[PDB]
Design an enzyme around this catalytic site. Sequence first.
Site, PDB file in Angstrom:
ATOM      1  N   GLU A 196       9.195   0.572  11.181  1.00  0.00           N
ATOM      2  CA  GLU A 196      10.249   1.846  11.278  1.00  0.00           C
ATOM      3  C   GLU A 196       9.633   3.097  11.522  1.00  0.00           C
ATOM      4  O   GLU A 196       8.810   3.361  10.605  1.00  0.00           O
ATOM      5  CB  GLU A 196      11.085   1.717  10.040  1.00  0.00           C
ATOM      6  CG  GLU A 196      12.674   2.675  10.349  1.00  0.00           C
ATOM      7  CD  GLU A 196      12.326   3.896   9.755  1.00  0.00           C
ATOM      8  OE1 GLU A 196      12.496   4.096   8.465  1.00  0.00           O
ATOM      9  OE2 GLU A 196      12.097   4.910  10.539  1.00  0.00           O
TER      10      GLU A 196
ATOM     11  N   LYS B 274       0.988  -1.196   0.085  1.00  0.00           N
ATOM     12  CA  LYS B 274      -0.055  -0.039   0.246  1.00  0.00           C
ATOM     13  C   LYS B 274       0.860   1.144  -0.077  1.00  0.00           C
ATOM     14  O   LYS B 274       1.430   1.628   1.042  1.00  0.00           O
ATOM     15  CB  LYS B 274      -1.176   0.059   1.027  1.00  0.00           C
ATOM     16  CG  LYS B 274      -2.081   0.924   1.107  1.00  0.00           C
ATOM     17  CD  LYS B 274      -2.439   1.806   2.144  1.00  0.00           C
ATOM     18  CE  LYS B 274      -1.376   3.107   2.393  1.00  0.00           C
ATOM     19  NZ  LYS B 274      -1.709   4.404   2.157  1.00  0.00           N
TER      20      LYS B 274
END
Lengths: 494, 494, 494, 494
Positions: free
Chosen positions: B262, B186
Amino acid sequence: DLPVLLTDLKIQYTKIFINNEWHDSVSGKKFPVFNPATEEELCQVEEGDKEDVDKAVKAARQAFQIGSPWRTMDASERGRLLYKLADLIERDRLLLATMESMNGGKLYSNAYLSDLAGCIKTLRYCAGWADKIQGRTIPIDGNFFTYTRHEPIGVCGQIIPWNFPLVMLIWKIGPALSCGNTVVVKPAEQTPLTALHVASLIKEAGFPPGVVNIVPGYGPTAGAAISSHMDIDKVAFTGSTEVGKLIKEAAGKSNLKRVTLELGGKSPCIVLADADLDNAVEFAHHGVFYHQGQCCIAASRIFVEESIYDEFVRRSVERAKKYILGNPLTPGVTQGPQIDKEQYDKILDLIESGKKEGAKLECGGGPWGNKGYFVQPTVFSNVTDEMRIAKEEIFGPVQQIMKFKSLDDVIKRANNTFYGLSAGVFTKDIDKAITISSALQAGTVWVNCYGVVSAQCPFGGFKMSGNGRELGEYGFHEYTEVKTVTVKISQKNS
Amino acid sequence: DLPVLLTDLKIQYTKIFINNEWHDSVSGKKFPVFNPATEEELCQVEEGDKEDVDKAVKAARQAFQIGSPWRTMDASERGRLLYKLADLIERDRLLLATMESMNGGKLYSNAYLSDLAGCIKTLRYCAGWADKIQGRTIPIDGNFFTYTRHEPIGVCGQIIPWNFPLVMLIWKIGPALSCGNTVVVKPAEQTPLTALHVASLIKEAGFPPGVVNIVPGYGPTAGAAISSHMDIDKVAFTGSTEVGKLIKEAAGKSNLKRVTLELGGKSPCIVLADADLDNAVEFAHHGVFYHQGQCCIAASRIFVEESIYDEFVRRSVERAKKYILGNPLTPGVTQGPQIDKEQYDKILDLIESGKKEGAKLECGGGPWGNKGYFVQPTVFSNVTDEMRIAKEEIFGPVQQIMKFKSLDDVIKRANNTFYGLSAGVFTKDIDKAITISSALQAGTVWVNCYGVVSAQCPFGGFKMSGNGRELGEYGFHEYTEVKTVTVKISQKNS
Amino acid sequence: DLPVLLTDLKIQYTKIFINNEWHDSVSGKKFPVFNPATEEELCQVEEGDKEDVDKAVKAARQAFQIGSPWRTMDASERGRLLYKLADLIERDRLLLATMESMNGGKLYSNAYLSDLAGCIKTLRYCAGWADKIQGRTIPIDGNFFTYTRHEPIGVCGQIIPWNFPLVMLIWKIGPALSCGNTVVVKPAEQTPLTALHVASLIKEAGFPPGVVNIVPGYGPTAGAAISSHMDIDKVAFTGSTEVGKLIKEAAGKSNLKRVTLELGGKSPCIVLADADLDNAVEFAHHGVFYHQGQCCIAASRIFVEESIYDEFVRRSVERAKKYILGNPLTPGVTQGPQIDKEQYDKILDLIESGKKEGAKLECGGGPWGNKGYFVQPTVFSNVTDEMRIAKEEIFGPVQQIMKFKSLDDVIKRANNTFYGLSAGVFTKDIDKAITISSALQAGTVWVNCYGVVSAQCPFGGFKMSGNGRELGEYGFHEYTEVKTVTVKISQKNS
Amino acid sequence: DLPVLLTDLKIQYTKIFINNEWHDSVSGKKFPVFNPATEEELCQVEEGDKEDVDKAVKAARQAFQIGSPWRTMDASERGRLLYKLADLIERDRLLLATMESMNGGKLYSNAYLSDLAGCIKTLRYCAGWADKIQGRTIPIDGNFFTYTRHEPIGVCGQIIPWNFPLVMLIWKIGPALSCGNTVVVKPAEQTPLTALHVASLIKEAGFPPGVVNIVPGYGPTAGAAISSHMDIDKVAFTGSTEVGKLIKEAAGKSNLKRVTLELGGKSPCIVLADADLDNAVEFAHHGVFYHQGQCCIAASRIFVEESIYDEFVRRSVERAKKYILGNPLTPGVTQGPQIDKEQYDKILDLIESGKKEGAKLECGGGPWGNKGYFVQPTVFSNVTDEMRIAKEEIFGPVQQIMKFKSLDDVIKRANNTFYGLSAGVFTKDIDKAITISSALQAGTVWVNCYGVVSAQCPFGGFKMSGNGRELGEYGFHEYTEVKTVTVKISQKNS
Ligand SMILES: NC(=O)C1=CN([C@@H]2O[C@H](COP(=O)(O)OP(=O)(O)OC[C@H]3O[C@@H](n4cnc5c(N)ncnc54)[C@H](O)[C@@H]3O)[C@@H](O)[C@H]2O)C=CC1
Ligand SMILES: [Cl-]
Ligand SMILES: [Cl-]
Ligand SMILES: [Cl-]
Ligand SMILES: [Cl-]
Ligand SMILES: [Cl-]
Ligand SMILES: [Cl-]
Ligand SMILES: [Cl-]
Ligand SMILES: [Cl-]
Ligand SMILES: [Cl-]
Ligand SMILES: [Cl-]
Ligand SMILES: [Cl-]
Ligand SMILES: [Cl-]
Ligand SMILES: [Cl-]
Ligand SMILES: [Cl-]
Ligand SMILES: [Cl-]
Ligand SMILES: [Cl-]
Ligand SMILES: [Cl-]
Ligand SMILES: [Cl-]
Ligand SMILES: [Cl-]
Ligand SMILES: [Cl-]
Ligand SMILES: [Yb+3]
Ligand SMILES: [Yb+3]
Ligand SMILES: [Yb+3]
Ligand SMILES: [Yb+3]
Ligand SMILES: [Yb+3]
Ligand SMILES: [Yb+3]
Ligand SMILES: [Yb+3]
Ligand SMILES: [Yb+3]
């Protein structure tokens, strides 16, 4: 806290060790063992020769057969045994350190605090790897299942020198046994005694018979039989360059056995202007004088930047004039004798070459005492690269100091040698530490230290300082044989 | 040698990519994509939502079934395909770098010379690992043969931010595909275009259909459907801390899928008195300002030893007053706009906090231009640890400089943060370089440099900067699932 | 050779263990501990809650600080300590095996010969890895020196179940401590006693204070405080799926701590026509009934090829009708009680579901005795995939047998579960062994055996059976945090 | 889809290749190259001797110097170059496969579909490892930072045989160059041509000059100069046992260079009663006859269980009577000639030994044709272990079939050989597959297949079949030299 044996050392183990049995020599011959400090015979030991080596090989081969207890036992149980052997060496640490000192000419505090500790730590290290030696599964092309077994090689002959009898025995047998090999060990003729004590502990620990066989005796006889043996799979050796050549030739001519060698060094230090001077003087001094200079890694060429050269030499001389020579068993004694006549003769000859070739003598330069193979700790300055003392491994308490002004030039001089076992770099500059260490052709490079050796690190030479690595993860490779197994399957999936 | 597109960019790929087919949205809905430099709509793209995500998951799952072309093909052929994809990206490098610049607000010279080069290099890196992903054979206790297969996990959903659209796509899909996973990606809603171009190259390269599926759309809709999907095995994410929390919660509530994140940083530099001052000023400056400060690793707290603090600040200001703002496509332009309104609003708010909280403004402090989300490059000195600009990730061109006198104290201040993505140490002292870098709680520590990132190195955060590592040997672990296979045998041998 | 305690067990360690100190609870509250065989209270133990957890975290954090004895000590000395702890557990093996039996409802011969042996072997295994945990040096692009440190993570909270109290404690602390972490352990409330005995041995072995902290108490209180703690870096958990979800959610909401979970299974066996029938019946029977079915890997779905199905079921029933129920301390007793009321109630409910849903009852089906949570060993045949007893983890002595005729079909049925912890394949066909084991979505697949678990092998689930691996080389990864250090140099050389 | 060259082969590259320059021989001497199918000279090639080898070594050494382009370039760029070389070989695949066929006596369809594909795949494999060759960081005892660099060794001499000229060139240079070594290659005198074509592609790809040097010529001259060279760091060799001995001796006498050897085999197959008979007959037949039996892994002892022995022999004879001899360039031709007179003479002599020693001749037994070194495909049954044809490597199209009834006995017979390169096991029994393969002393063991060789797997002999492994992760070790770097630090932390 340096404890001693509270009673005198009785020698007990003097025979050939095969299949956990004590054997006389086939010939019935025995040879004397001496104390290098007094030149007096300690005892007599069974002289192993070709016949006896053949018996050890037969025993080692039988213990390696498919289906034997040593092949079928759990890898963790191999590790269990090494750990137990380490406990036992720890138990007889006073005994073993004393034997080592008396037979090896080795300072007792070093024997106890260093050699013994190292043996014990290295065995525990090698014990830990046993059940962590692993093969691979491999995504080969085509419809196949492929794996590898990292198997033991088989019967490994292991030829050991006299400078670190015990440490070398453990460096050889720890890895080999952890990986599941069987071994035939030939101690230095000068120094069989500690190996045979350890053999008794191998039995007491409960290693299957034939897994470790120890054949004391001489090099051209016992040693050569190993190197030329048609049923020994690998030979490992630490010692002279000459014998290293003999071993490889013998191996090539016989059964192409695997060979790994650790041979001389002429290891250089490079001391830059910005170095911590006292730190560098101290490590370099110990780097060359340790165990009467009888160290493969002896820091036998010390290159110092001109602007700090005179200062470096001055403080090195000071440090070297402080030793006390004598019997390595007496507390306070800080330098023992050389191992034997031949080594003594070689050292004095080389010292004499240094004088004749016009090197500058700062101290020492001669023998010492009425008995024992003692040599005064000796320092030469203004040494040049063409001098014998700059080119040849001395293996005596003889330090070479030499000046440079060009960093490019000194790296080339440092590398202009067929040896390459180790080196030392002394500097506060990060970039220089990294770039210099990369550029030195040497197996171990120390930065701002020297002679730092541990079980966790691989150790071995570049160039004619030998081949292969001992210890560390990497060293364990040299005691396995890789077998690829590839199985046809109908359809593979990732 | 910075070449450009010799003709204008035509947008072509604007649809959902599933089973190597271009799909409209189930709803029929589309959403605008803008150029952050002009605030003008570039095109409209199919808005993926839950339905479309379900279709991508079904396709990815089917492509992962035992017996499919992607499971049964040689691992080296997986690598072959990634390498081909890299050649294709290299072929459309001008096109892709231009698209990235125009959609991402990203300086074109950086896009071309850095982002594109990085994508290409990282794909080739990941290609090389494909047939080198290996299990183990293991000397288990008892009479058994035990091996491990490092299998792909399965269907991996991968949620990507807008700051490095292409680089992040490659970081996510390179490793995942090398290990044999299938993916549902996505893109950031702001930046779908380059991902869809790459999707066309995935088809052209010949990846089996369903191996890569790209579903552009919005976070709470498409993104959440991924995080909460009962048939997705792992989700990887780069972006905000907030969303990272949402993802983990969603994963925990649904099917306990594997998660790797992250997230922000507030990465510190420590500059010691002995540092090369210009080197440190230059790396730290680029460390904070790169890509308009829109870097996870932005060097957003710079601690400088008091004796060089004023000098450091002076030269940092000089360096920062030299930028040219404008359209990132025009040669000479050295600072583009921020990605969008929300980011712009956040940066200006935080700048305002810095002024109100009593930090010292050296330059900038406000917006720029009549169009585009431009913010003046801004420098604050005398920043303290309690200020918003010291604590919160700004993600804008805003640099914080701060003084210290006690080394112990600055290490603790540097670590007094819930972030821990990276840090920088500047010094000529070896011991300080090693000891400081060990003591910083950060995933990457640079010494005498900053922002050095390569395919060969793992990358990831300590603490709330995320979990897991990307790239390097180590990163490949997070895209495999280990299966132990243990087979009864009659007798094992070592 | 099954020795016993020659004198009665005195309970001594009943307190919270922090900084090698025995603490009362902050509240002053204590909770009862029972013997599941008699339903009688054994003793009272200090009830740890949030406050006490905070104290353990503060202690663990302090012990992890840079410069502390646990950070600075040699890695080999960490290993030395684990090995010593193993010797001590070996010393109190009779004591510990008895405590485990009496508190855990665990057959004493299993406790002694299996659990205790496993603890000891696993500690020695983990000890061996300590100084073999290694980073990398990496040939990064550009002129840089890059290495990685595989550091400990930090403070690890470890939440432990009641089925294997000691084994789970060692599986959690062995790896964690080998890698240099500090730990806060929360035992099952049912089974704190053996953990606290081991805590006394941790002190006696000489681990630095704060390295291991043990906080007995309850799940929603002590357990939750751990999962939601802002200064705990990682939580590891074995237990229910429900709590696993709670833990991940808590972690995501708090400080995004690393999480690794081991949860249920509904592990299948596939028995092909050509299987060694008796071997398969024996392993599958023990696979499901071991420790009263209270095993994560319980072989709770057994698929047998139609042509051998009736025979397989017949012999399974025979084998199951042979148990002796009673106190697990009495020699000859071959089935103890379930851990507690809740588990007992769940098992009986599920047995009742099996009857109502039309499964065929071969034996058992009800409780046993006047005291203790005993359940008759129970066998169901003709079980279908929609039955509760086919879908849900029972965790009781209840075996499901089920027939198949199509190999494709049974692999899909075996995989049609959100669990995936392990599986068993029984066949003499090489190709089937390899291909079936590859296709099962399960962390461990046994071939022609079952329940073979060793320290050398990683262990963990696919899918909702959890994430991460414990033990083996691979498991050690989950207890390190990788830090990349990258240093600018003037020129790199290969 | 077997394409051919649409125009005739023009030979172009006939000179010594040094520093990317084409050189005449120092002597001015040239030697003929022949086509083994017609016995007609193809061209003349510059005869390299000691002088020319010295020039190649000087060039290779210069290219390896610290600071050179090959030392300083990114590891990934080394990999880039190998990948490009693979593309180029792919480009000239028709040319190279034709040259190989015409010069090597090698069937063209094999050359094209197998040798060329293998070269290309192996180069791409080796390319992928370049930037994945990594050292370690090591938790050494004491306050030190220790890492290892896995450096290239240096100048590697590589001596190549005539049976797989191209494949052997790639196996030697791929790994060596990936690891950053420089090479001096000596092709077989019979087969220099394809190596020199590849040399032109090495230049075209852009390898720095001196990285690959190719010196065609003779063994006792060029070959020996390499083996005895004082500035070559390692020699790798594939060929005869005799020369292997000569190489090791030369190495030992000169500079103790590293040596790795691949030598003969007398590889056994064991076919059990339960084996898939046709599968076993087919793989074993191709296993012995491939490339006119001129394969190191030739399956030259086939042990078949008595109950299926006559059937196995019958079908093997059928399969062998189906070949078409002739020019390997003509489609339909299924057996080319032997490489040369000496090999031809050796094969016929050995066939004659088989007849005289009382083995049973099933077919063949003599030469074929008026031109070319053709030997009829020959099968012997009732072969015993003392016959020359059972003991000596034939390297011709000669198959030995032999019966056994005792499994213990046949494993010992299979191992009763100084060779140990590979073996084959044929069975449907899992336990037998695993246990037999473990017990065979051979580097590769195939199960239910034979001659399966891939880039992902290490390959090498046990015993006198050689030492070291080529290819796979493991093979890369033999092209690195480990250097330990140990740095004193003030305080270490885990
Ligand atoms: N994988 C395995 O080995 C185990 C599986 N289970 C499964 O779970 C089922 C129920 O058994 P339980 O005893 O309830 O296991 P549980 O998951 O409830 O308890 C296991 C550990 O988690 C702790 N815990 C409980 N609530 C918690 C919370 N809110 N936060 C943090 N920690 C918490 C407990 O105190 C204990 O230390 C069993 O019937 C079985 O199917 C149970 C125990 C072990
Ligand atoms: Cl000092
Ligand atoms: Cl001598
Ligand atoms: Cl005398
Ligand atoms: Cl290493
Ligand atoms: Cl500068
Ligand atoms: Cl946002
Ligand atoms: Cl937002
Ligand atoms: Cl506007
Ligand atoms: Cl790493
Ligand atoms: Cl991992
Ligand atoms: Cl049976
Ligand atoms: Cl519960
Ligand atoms: Cl519950
Ligand atoms: Cl009651
Ligand atoms: Cl593994
Ligand atoms: Cl068949
Ligand atoms: Cl010849
Ligand atoms: Cl003729
Ligand atoms: Cl391997
Ligand atoms: Cl190796
Ligand atoms: Yb000698
Ligand atoms: Yb004398
Ligand atoms: Yb957001
Ligand atoms: Yb505006
Ligand atoms: Yb519960
Ligand atoms: Yb009751
Ligand atoms: Yb020859
Ligand atoms: Yb002829």
